[PDB]
């Protein structure tokens, strides 16, 4: 909708299931949980939840930004990322390279006294020009929380360096912003990990070309004293193309008998093609 949110990382960690494997990009789950925790660290959780439950609030997944915006590959029409100029060139039939945006390398770490803790952490070290840019509805609240995030890191194993970034809030190129909708009816692509409400699951599962991601893991909490695993949901990945747009939800994936709500941003944001 509104402006991009360019994020220059230099050694982040975006774990996909295991600590030993980073996945070069983070879904809207992770940026929304990051904004919720940075709003809870400040005094403004309820204002951000009032903005997020409102319909106009958008978040999309992170995609590489070496000089221009990239987009996920639309599943099934003719890679994993396309230049914003090369989307319509790809969809009519062409071939591209999956450009090296980062080096995903593992580092061996230990805990020396314990003599059984010998672990590895996979790090996506970006390549001196690549950033990630969530697309969002611009607000003073959101820029406040996002410029708070850039000194608090993003992803996994932060407080050990991994994930600390810096902002550039740039306007959208005008050939991109034409194609960002939520209510179009013909041949649209989700560029965020969404999940339809049950009235649209039928129409999305029938005429939709998609991918499943299992969003699971532990629920971070300052109020539980032990760590409980979330409710392990499955959702449509980025680049999933559909018959038309759907209306998604913020899934409550709270543990059983749990104090606060563990949310999950699966509201969509779409790209026309």
């Amino acid at each position: 909708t509104y402006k991009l949110y360019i994020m220059t990382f230099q050694n982040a960690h975006f774990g996909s299931g295991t600590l030993d494997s980073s996945k070069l990009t983070f879904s809207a789950d992770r940026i929304f949980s990051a904004l919720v925790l940075e709003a809870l660290k400040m005094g403004k959780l309820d204002a951000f939840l009032a903005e997020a439950n409102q319909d106009k609030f958008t978040l999309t997944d992170a995609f590489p930004f070496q000089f221009g915006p990239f987009l996920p590959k639309p599943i099934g029409y003719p890679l994993q990322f396309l230049a914003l100029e090369n989307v319509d060139d790809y969809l009519n039939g062409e071939l591209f390279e999956n450009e090296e945006h980062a080096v995903i390398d593992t580092v061996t770490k230990n805990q020396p006294h314990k003599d059984d803790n010998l672990y590895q952490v996979a790090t996506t070290r970006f390549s001196n020009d690549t950033s990630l840019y969530v697309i969002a509805n611009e607000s003073d609240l959101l820029n406040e929380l996002m410029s708070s995030l850039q000194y608090s890191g993003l992803g996994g194993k932060r407080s050990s360096g991994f994930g600390r970034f810096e902002l550039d809030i740039q306007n959208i190129p005008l050939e991109l912003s034409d194609r960002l909708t939520k209510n179009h009816s013909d041949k649209v692509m989700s560029l965020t990990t969404a999940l339809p409400v049950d009235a649209d699951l039928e129409e999305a599962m029938e005429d939709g070309h998609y991918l499943l991601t299992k969003s699971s893991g532990f629920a971070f909490s300052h109020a539980t004293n032990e760590n409980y695993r979330k409710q392990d949901l499955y959702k449509f990945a980025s680049g999933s193309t559909f018959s038309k747009t759907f209306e998604g939800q913020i899934v409550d994936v709270r543990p059983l008998d749990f104090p606060h709500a563990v949310l999950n941003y699966a509201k969509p944001l779409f790209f026309k093609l």
């Binding site: 590895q120 049950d198 599962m205 998609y210 499955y234």
Partner: protein
């Protein structure tokens, strides 16, 4: 079913006279010879009359049309005569599959005989055959008998274009088409006559019967990744890829030999093209995928896809055959993208059970007989459990997956052979504490091979595209090529690992992963490549990465690092081996005939026949090979001439010969003989290190 069983046995014994026409030969027709030889074997009137009239009793016309659609003295040609070079002949020598002996690599000089030992094979057939029940229970072991014996004798063997497919594959594919014809005709209902549309008109060829079904066990590779347990997990997926085929043919009115390619994840079939078949395919796909949801939860997914092809599409035509595979793989890819039913995700979104099973199966991995039980453990299907048993048995079987033997293990009924597995010599925590030679010197190093066939997915459907724009590319040639690759990489590898201190964890041709002890690991890789290229006469090659690791290390880091090595080998020319590192990626032929057989023998022959030069000279040569300025040529020249004079004048001549060889492959500009010499010195100074 009493019609279909007799139809199947007659369709396999279609051409059994064509081995009896050879052993104790005559001039009379092979149909009469087989149909009179079969009369001395249990005297089934329907099957014998079907053999009487296969090459001219409604059942015999099915066999007559099945021979025609299956088709499309002189010894059997090899299947790799047809790939991308029109220059070899290289025929076979028909004896047996022994399954525990050395292969019969096709020689270029075996074109002549085609007569010698067929009496012994015919006596084997008469011996195991004649006392037969011809029920549907014994419908299984006759295919195993044919692939054991008739697999290296040729088919019709006249000088015409085919010359290649065996008798055990022509008969197999004929039984496939015959059962498909019988199902299409009996579920269309009209069968009066069978002869009324087949023998008298050829308008039956131009309509869509015969759906070629297929599937793909997606997520097989990431499911696999405490190392014998990894072999057990890969073999678990292999038996699942068998049991899907077996149960899908059980739900139909079929058995095996309605089958093609198996192994890995892919499999291909030939079915009826009735409505009954496609609704039971959709039903079986739904049922097995909700099984996989119940146990594996999207880590595994079966996607059946199919294409209905007319009979004249295979008869010839070169492009519509790949169009049939295109329709198939398009449906497979569509269901691979669009995984699930609606409520199977709605219901889905709101110490261990099967890992205890895989632990017990990792215990039972050492057996040979594998049994399908109702409730024993290791579920491999809806209402199915999988157990590994010895001959202390006879507890409620439903199939017996006998192991790679398939003839001596084929003594029990209901025996499907499986080709996987074997040679775990010692446990993996001892392979680096070995190597430990009898002289007592060598470096304590695990090694691991990952080798794969280069250009293999291109090979299965485009290898036969070269020789002729009107490409050969039969259904039967693709079947025999897949059978050759599964017969090489999953059986014969256990004989190339005969006494070589290693353990082969999994092997399918798509990837072969073999941990072991490093001298015999490199020897195993060299023997595997040379035996492979004698097996295939080039035109199809393999590339390998051989890591090297100390003991007490993981097998995830290890497998990943040598995966990076095999990928750096893939990037070279995809015919290449990368020993130990991201450099050192040699071509495989230069590694064999210019590192082992040329440079390292000339290094070993020097340093074991002289006493004055030792390790220190070798280390200082390794450094000059590793730096290599223009100045280090002069510095190496000075060093070697300076060590000429220091020798005893009795070894000054032999040191002078080594001086000339080392300086000549140091100052060679081409940079081949320099890094090859560096690796030869690394291996030599590895294999002579003490404790």
């Amino acid at each position: 079913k009493k019609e279909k069983i007799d139809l199947f046995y007659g369709a396999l014994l279609h051409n059994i006279g064509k081995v009896i026409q050879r052993a104790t030969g005559e001039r009379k027709k092979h149909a009469l010879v087989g149909a009179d030889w079969f009369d001395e074997i249990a005297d089934n009137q329907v099957i014998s009359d079907q053999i009487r009239y296969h090459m001219a009793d409604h059942l015999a016309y099915i066999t007559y049309i099945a021979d025609n659609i299956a088709s499309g003295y002189t010894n059997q040609a090899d299947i790799f005569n047809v790939f991308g070079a029109q220059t070899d002949k290289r025929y076979f020598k028909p004896t047996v599959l022994n399954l525990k002996s050395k292969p019969n690599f096709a020689s270029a000089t075996y074109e002549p005989f085609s007569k010698g030992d067929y009496a012994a094979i015919a006596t084997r057939i008469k011996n195991e055959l004649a006392e037969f029940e011809f029920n549907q229970v014994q419908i299984d072991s006759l295919l195993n008998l044919f692939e054991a014996t008739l697999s290296f004798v040729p088919s019709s063997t006249n000088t015409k274009e085919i010359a290649d497919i065996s008798l055990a594959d022509h008969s197999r594919l004929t039984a496939a088409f015959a059962l498909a014809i019988y199902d299409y005709l009996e579920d269309k209902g009209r069968h009066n006559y069978k002869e009324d549309l087949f023998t008298k008109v050829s308008a039956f060829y131009e309509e869509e019967a015969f759906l070629l079904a297929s599937f793909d066990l997606s997520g097989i590779q990431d499911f696999i990744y405490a190392a014998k347990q990894l072999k057990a997990r890969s073999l678990y997926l292999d038996f699942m890829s068998e049991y899907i085929a077996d149960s899908l043919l059980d739900k139909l009115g079929l058995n095996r030999a309605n089958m093609l390619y198996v192994g890995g994840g892919h499999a291909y079939f030939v079915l009826a093209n009735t409505e009954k078949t496609v609704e039971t395919l959709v039903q079986f796909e739904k049922d097995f995928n909700q099984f996989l949801l119940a146990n594996f939860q999207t880590r595994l997914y079966v996607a059946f896809g199919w294409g209905s092809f007319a009979a004249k599409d295979i008869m010839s035509s070169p492009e519509s055959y790949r169009q049939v595979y295109q329709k198939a793989s398009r449906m497979i890819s569509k269901k691979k993208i669009s995984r699930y039913d609606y409520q199977t995700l709605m219901l889905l979104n709101r110490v261990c059970d099967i890992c205890r099973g895989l632990y017990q199966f990792s215990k039972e991995i050492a057996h040979d007989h594998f049994i399908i039980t109702e409730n024993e453990g290791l579920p491999i299907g809806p209402n199915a459990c999988l157990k590994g048993v010895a001959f202390e048995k006879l507890s409620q079987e439903a199939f017996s997956r006998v192991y790679v033997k398939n003839d001596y293990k084929a003594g029990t009924v209901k025996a499907t052979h499986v080709f996987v597995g074997d040679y775990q010599c010692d446990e993996i925590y001892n392979y680096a504490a070995l190597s430990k030679n009898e002289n007592g010197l060598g470096i304590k190093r695990l090694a691991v091979v990952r080798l794969d066939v280069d250009d293999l997915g291109a090979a299965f459907m485009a290898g036969f595209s070269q020789q002729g724009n009107g490409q050969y590319s039969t259904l039967s040639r693709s079947a025999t090529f897949s059978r050759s690759m599964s017969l090489f990489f999953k059986v014969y590898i256990n004989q190339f690992a005969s006494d070589k201190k290693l353990s082969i964890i999994y092997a399918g041709g798509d990837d072969v992963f073999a941990i072991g002890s490093w001298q015999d690991i490199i020897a195993f890789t060299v023997e595997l490549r040379e035996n492979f290229i004698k097996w295939t006469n080039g035109k199809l090659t393999l590339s390998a990465g051989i890591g090297l690791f100390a003991d007490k290390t993981p097998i995830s880091l290890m497998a990943h690092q040598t995966g990076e090595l095999e990928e750096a080998a893939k990037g070279n020319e995809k015919d290449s081996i990368s020993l130990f590192s991201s450099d050192y990626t040699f071509k495989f032929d230069r590694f064999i005939t210019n590192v082992y057989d040329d440079k390292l023998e000339q290094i070993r022959y020097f340093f074991n026949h002289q006493d004055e030069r030792g390790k220190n000279f070798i280390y200082k040569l390794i450094e000059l090979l590793r730096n290599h300025d223009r100045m280090n040529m002069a510095r190496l020249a000075y060093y070697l001439t300076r060590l000429e004079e220091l020798t005893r004048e009795t070894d000054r001549d032999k040191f002078k010969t080594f001086k000339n060889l080392f300086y000549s492959w140091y100052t060679n500009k081409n940079d081949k003989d320099r890094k090859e010499a560096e690796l030869a010195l690394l291996l030599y100074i590895y294999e002579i290190r003490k404790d």
